[PDB]
Specification:
The complex is a heterotrimer, with 2 copies of chain A (about 575 residues) and 1 copy of chain B (about 120 residues). Chain A is mostly helical. Chain A contains 20 helices and 6 strands. Helix content of chain A is about 60%, strand content about 5%. The N and C termini of chain B lie far apart (about 40 Å). The chains are: A mainly alpha (about 575), B mainly beta (about 120). Bound molecules: adenosine-5'-diphosphate (2 copies). Chains A, C: InterPro entries: AAA+_ATPase (IPR003593), ABC1_TM_dom (IPR011527), ABC1_TM_sf (IPR036640), ABC_transporter-like_ATP-bd (IPR003439), ABC_transporter-like_CS (IPR017871), P-loop_NTPase (IPR027417), Type_1_exporter (IPR039421).
Chain lengths: ~575, ~120, ~575
């Protein structure tokens, strides 16, 4: 299952993964030596009580220079450089963890967004956007923190090992009683409480669902609630379900606190018991072993979050991990459209027996036929969600037809020339969603700039009377989609964005549904003038907004009728 | 439920100072850029000033150029506008509006409104 | 600002608040007693001779005890009994806190949800659902978890008060050094790291929105992305924004880890200092003062989460707190409709010059005239945004008009009888939002059971041939909005739900939009036959569905023309 990991990471990503793995081991050796460095220093300081017992001062300090109180201070500041050094080195390690995790958050997510951009429009249509968005930004945060949790896990299990080795290097019955008492505490909390952690933890997820769902549902029938006027039948189901949500939630916040509270009374008991074994058993080394009792203290102080993070990354390697890496390939190994070829449009746009519906949806057409000569300016009158936008999705390069040909100058519209065919069409989606940046980038759609191609477009899209009064001019921040741009201002910008492509076919797609009565016809004429040199397809949800359209195709229940 | 209420513009003789304060509610005041407008007696509408989200880029019109200095206070959620000298047109009741109201179509939008302060400063 | 508190909470919520706050003070004494029980037990475990000296430990030595080693062991189990008692004690305290917080998460949200359910229909229309939803379950969530933080804060500052006082009794120079060293580390970290925590932490909130908005904008323009074909212009604005979001996130999760990593070096250095400083000073009682080292160890080990929970509750008392309490007097003290009277309907529903607009908007009508006789079966033909549902919501008891009379048998529809007139109308929404419960509860609208009238409802809503194939039948948990229920069967419940009200006027409101003509025509024919004995206002969105409609009022752009 590990083979799916190396498939995503590259040389700037893989080499960084190894650096953290070695540093995870080295940071462990740094912590151990930082602990072990207390033992000599505090042996010599505690050796002052027993005067002289071993060659540790009067019989050891006389090997370099200086007196006793000077070598105990120098050893003291020697302890505090190593600890400030560690405090910086351990901080740098926890910085490389974030630099690698959040750097892969970008390096990985940069490609999945391209994958869902290259799939056919039908494959982007079958899955909703509230799912693809999570497929290109939700999975990456989980994988990044999972690899970081994996590297931090290696650092920790290493810290635990060699620090336990340092404890075993000191005492026998204690480190034995300590290891036994530690693994006894690793139990119960992981086998009797950890099940109840989710036994009352997923019942809280059950209760939160049972509360949010009936709360959102209750707000929708507010009209029907005002008609009923009696809210008793609704609040008698709300108070009992909220009270069902209440205790199902308090049992989660109770069993999530028992482990640490019990671990505190334990930690106290395993602490004072590290003492009751030293004074009773006659290893009474006022400095030899009283130094080591401080080593057990510091070791435990470095060991409590040491054991906590292991279970944290363990749950992170089960909650995440195997459920994230598999979907990754499948979503990024996904297939994308491949076609090379050109096509020319000078005569008419034959359709030739389309017959189409979505993947698992019924056929909203069946033997749908029409043709569009250059410059007809046709329309598509329909009943909303019946098959207008579906048919126009078929006319354009999107949606490969079932039994259709869609001829262009007696030449079929297929994947070879659909790439070049998609270039000469704008969209202008009336309720156009802009991104918070300059309107110039919103017209160019980010594809750099061309200035000599923007002023003419703005002048044609009747935005010239709009750029003058803006504070930053063409550089003013558009503010999300609209906000700073009202509906028809977004229309003019959408028209400008389409005109910037220098197209030959323009499609409206309900371009009159998000405006007032006065703002529609002016924009429609402002489009009719700049479409005199072009063609046009209109998906009007109403009649008389097309009038100047020489063709009016009304799609009913599968068949295409013609009006004006 | 965007409801704005500006109230700080009374009748005071021309050649003096008059700062109007527009209060806003119902939206993140900092993310939205703001503007000003006015409706003349008998005439349609007429634009005044504009400003960005950060308050570091200003805009005015030729009939009021070099006369006003617009400031944004993103603390009390208020949009100020200093005024000096009044013409037989600087009267059309300055409302507030939300985003960029400046073209001749996005003016037919009730993005704010709210009472208003009549400032008909004649000779 | 404290006066806003007692207005919401009752007497029980005050007896329980004192229950928690006195416990908050007492749990500090239990911890200190659990720590202060160590120094005696350890000063007697080491120096056995204390059990035959001092006016405190002499006679108990020869009261059933016999030797000295037997009583010190007894003292040990007495400590672990106290520590298991203390662990159970703290588990009960942390059990009442979560019971009070998640208890007020229900008690408050129940009142706020009841308040938003009884306001006028116009006040509920102006604000979106996510705002209200978070106003009745997100705001309650913050205030609930805030009160517990204040209690825990006072409990916490108390345990720091008497644990620091217990340390002062033990030592003079050591506690003084620790306090100076603490308030030196309480400084620097709170004024040098704390700024950069938010200087790179609220920059994260900045970069996250600036990274999501340009990503979420591209998904809505995926159609135009396929047309442009070139993604380099989209990815040159994505890679440059992501390489900025990358570093903007690595510095946040780094500076949020600088404290505790520097804190480790602090904890290490303040430990070996204590024992070295206490081993250089010649108070070496072998046990008298070297046991006090263990009290300092247990005191600090109890003071690390002690310092963490104080700032956690202080952040909870600033991040939330003042932003929640004020917005409840403005959410709970909300006003609601009045009136107490009855109304009768038997002749005509004269509208007579409606003219209507919302709070601060324009008027969609300006003089709108019609009249509805009992049993007229009228319809409203308009556009997708003209005001088709507005006029009908004006005819019925909803929507207090600006200049409209809404006469009912030459009697005015006002607040005294709007309740009674709302009682005699049923909505039947086509895209009905069902709740995951038995279909009987769905039809009753939660108003308990009623097999008498309710059994007749199923026979009227022609669900009987669908209840038969249903596994649980009338008690079938419908399965959220629409599990195995097709669109037509959802409509049958929509009819059944309003039929249980025994109404007099039936609304439809776009009862044709998302179902094939057949699966709806069978429902539309069912409607016209069961509407003979009542009146009905249809808000049809498409034509040919109102064949047998006797009246068809078409509202254009302010005026009302009549069709069939
Ligand atoms: N993005 C989508 N994902 C899934 N189903 C869709 C999507 N868009 C449309 N549909 C379904 O396809 C049918 C046709 O939709 P649409 O093409 O919008 O109709 P029209 O062409 O009349 O606008 C609808 O009934 C809808 O349920
Ligand atoms: N649920 C809603 N939320 C926000 N605004 C609404 C809502 N319903 C209607 N409006 C506003 O009221 C106006 C009237 O629209 P509406 O009554 O929905 O017409 P129809 O129902 O005939 O499409 C619209 O311009 C719209 O801005």
């Amino acid at each position: 299952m590990v083979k799916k990991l190396f498939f995503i990471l590259s040389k700037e990503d893989k080499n960084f993964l190894f650096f953290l793995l070695v540093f995870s081991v080295f940071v462990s050796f740094i912590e151990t030596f930082a602990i072990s460095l207390v033992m000599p220093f505090i042996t010599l300081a505690s050796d002052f009580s027993y005067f002289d017992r071993n060659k540790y001062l009067i019989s050891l300090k006389e090997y370099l220079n200086i007196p006793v109180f000077e070598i105990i201070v120098y050893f003291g500041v020697g302890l505090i450089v190593f600890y400030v050094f560690r405090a910086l080195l351990n901080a740098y390690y926890f910085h490389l963890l974030a630099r690698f995790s959040k750097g892969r958050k970008h390096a990985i997510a940069y490609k999945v967004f391209s994958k869902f951009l290259n799939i056919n429009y039908e494959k982007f249509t079958q899955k909703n956007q509230s799912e693809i968005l999570k497929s290109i930004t939700g999975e990456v945060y989980n994988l990044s923190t999972m690899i970081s949790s994996f590297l931090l896990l290696m650092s920790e299990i290493f810290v635990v090992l060699l620090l336990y080795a340092l404890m075993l290097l000191i005492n026998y019955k204690i480190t034995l009683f300590l290891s036994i008492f530690m693994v006894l505490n690793a139990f119960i909390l992981v086998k009797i409480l950890s099940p109840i952690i989710k036994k009352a933890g997923l019942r809280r997820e059950e209760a939160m669902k049972n509360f949010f769902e009936i709360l959102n549902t209750n707000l929708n029938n507010f009209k029907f609630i005002k008609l009923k006027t009696k809210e008793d039948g609704v609040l008698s189901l709300f108070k009992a379900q909220s009270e069902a949500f209440s205790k199902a939630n308090i049992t989660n916040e109770s069993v999530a606190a028992v482990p640490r509270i019990y671990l505190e009374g334990i930690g106290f008991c395993v602490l004072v018991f590290i003492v009751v074994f030293l004074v009773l058993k006659n290893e009474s080394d006022i400095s030899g072993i009283l130094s080591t009792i401080s080593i057990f203290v510091l070791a435990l102080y470095r060991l409590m979050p040491s054991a906590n993070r292991i279970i944290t990354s363990y749950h992170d390697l089960l909650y995440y991990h195997s459920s994230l890496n598999i979907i990754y390939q499948n979503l990024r190994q996904e297939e994308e459209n491949l076609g090379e070829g050109k096509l020319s449009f000078n005569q008419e746009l034959k359709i030739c027996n389309l017959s189409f519906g979505y993947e698992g949806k019924k056929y909203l057409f069946k033997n749908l036929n029409l043709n569009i000569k250059k410059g007809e300016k046709i329309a598509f009158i329909g009943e909303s969600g019946c098959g207008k936008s579906t048919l126009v999705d078929l006319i354009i390069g999107l949606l490969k037809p079932k039994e259709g040909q869609i001829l262009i100058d007696k030449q079929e519209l297929n994947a070879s020339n659909a790439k070049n065919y998609r270039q000469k069409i704008g969209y202008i989606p009336q309720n156009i969603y802009l991104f918070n940046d300059s309107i110039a980038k919103n017209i160019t759609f980010g594809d750099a700039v061309d200035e000599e191609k923007l002023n003419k477009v703005i002048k044609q899209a009747n935005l010239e009377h709009f750029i003058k009064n803006l504070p930053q001019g063409v550089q003013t921040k558009v503010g999300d989609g609209g906000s700073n741009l009202s509906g028809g201002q977004k229309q003019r910008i959408a028209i400008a964005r389409a005109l910037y492509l220098e197209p030959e076919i323009l499609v409206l797609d309900q371009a009159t549904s998000a405006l007032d009565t006065q703002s529609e016809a002016k924009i429609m004429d402002e489009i009719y003038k700049i479409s005199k040199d072009k063609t046009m397809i209109i998906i009007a949800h109403r009649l008389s907004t097309i009038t100047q359209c020489d063709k009016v195709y009304r799609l009913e229940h599968g068949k295409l009728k013609e009006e004006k | 439920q965007v409801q704005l209420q500006e109230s700080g513009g009374g009748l005071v003789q021309p050649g003096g100072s008059l700062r109007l304060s527009c209060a806003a509610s119902g939206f993140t005041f900092s993310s939205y850029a703001m503007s000003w407008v006015r409706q003349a007696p008998g005439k349609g509408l007429e634009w005044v000033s504009a400003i960005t989200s950060g308050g570091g880029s200003t805009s005015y019109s030729d009939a009021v150029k070099g006369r006003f200095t617009i400031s944004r206070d993103n603390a009390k959620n208020t949009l100020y506008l200093q005024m000096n000298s009044l013409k037989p047109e600087d009267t059309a009741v300055y409302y507030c509006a939300k985003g960029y109201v400046v073209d001749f179509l996005d003016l037919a939008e009730y993005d704010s409104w709210g009472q208003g302060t009549q400032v008909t400063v004649s000779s």
